[PDB]
């Protein structure tokens, strides 16, 4: 996350931190995700498309730090890893950038609600907040585009929803943005998602409900003028989510 502030998992308790294990037991971060039910985390297919074997992945909930453990965290295996069979990416945009992970502890259990872990509601079909609405994104992604390191502490920031019309300008992304995507950015262009933030949540209040409006997917650079964040538009993937869940 460019800009924004350090937070803790208690302020984003639906945030899931997804890791890959290596032949030598080295564990590296992959991407973020969101807890949408006790056994299900939603994320982005592009995060997994190169190493699609569920066995390599670990998922943490209740976790506030990237390479250290935090009190109140819970560790899960991936029982099912479901990618979107129409995933594609031209050179910039990612289409159908959405994935599900069924999580299961070693005792065979799913998440339980606590101080650090809660589910995030999905929107009802085709229901997005109005443009101008202030939303939250969270992740362990880069703090600057040029960094080689990732912050150790969870961050969040606020961004505003942008109309397709406005996002579909030449000097933004044009028709590179489809109707199954959604743009958000800082009016002053100082805060944004970046590498490592993908799969993570874009959360808005909608009908007095904290709601998973988007999933961090793509964008040109990070916090670049006229280059908003581009998010999988969850309210247009309900059938896919019901049919796999």
């Amino acid at each position: 996350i460019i800009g924004g502030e350090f937070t803790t998992i208690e302020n984003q308790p639906w945030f899931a931190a997804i890791y890959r294990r290596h032949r030598g037991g080295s564990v590296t971060y992959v991407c973020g995700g969101s807890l949408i039910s006790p056994c299900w985390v939603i994320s982005a297919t592009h995060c997994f498309i190169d190493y699609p074997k569920k066995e390599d992945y670990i998922v943490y909930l209740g976790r506030s730090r990237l390479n250290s453990n935090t009190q109140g965290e819970m560790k899960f295996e991936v029982e099912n890893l479901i990618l979107h069979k129409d995933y594609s990416a031209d050179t910039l945009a990612h289409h159908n950038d959405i994935a599900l992970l069924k999580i299961r502890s070693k005792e065979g259990r799913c998440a339980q609600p606590s101080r650090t872990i809660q589910t995030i509601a999905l929107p009802s079909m085709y229901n997005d907040p109005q443009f101008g609405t202030s939303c939250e994104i969270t992740g362990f992604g880069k703090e600057q585009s040029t960094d080689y390191l990732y912050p150790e502490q969870l961050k969040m920031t606020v961004v505003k929803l942008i109309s397709h019309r406005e996002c579909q300008q030449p000097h933004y992304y044009g028709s590179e943005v489809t109707t199954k995507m959604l743009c958000a950015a800082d009016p002053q262009w100082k805060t944004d998602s970046c590498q490592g933030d993908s799969g993570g949540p874009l959360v808005c209040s909608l009908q007095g409900r904290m709601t998973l409006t988007g999933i961090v997917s793509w964008g040109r650079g990070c916090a670049l003028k006229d280059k908003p964040g581009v998010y999988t538009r969850v309210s247009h993937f309900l059938p896919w989510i019901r049919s796999h869940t």
């Binding site: 290596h22 080295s26 590296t28 971060y29 992959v30 991407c31 592009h46 995060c47 498309i49 190169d50 190493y51 990416a89 050179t91 990612h94 992604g141 880069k142 585009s145 990732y150 998602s193 970046c194 590498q195 490592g196 933030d197 993908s198 799969g199 793509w218 964008g219 040109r220 650079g221 990070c222 964040g229």
Partner: peptide, 17 residues
């Protein structure tokens, strides 16, 4: 170069492609 240890290797900001 960019490896299998790389975080979110197809994320915005990544050198892939």
């Amino acid at each position: 170069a960019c490896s299998r240890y790389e975080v979110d290797c197809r994320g915005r900001x990544s050198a892939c492609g």
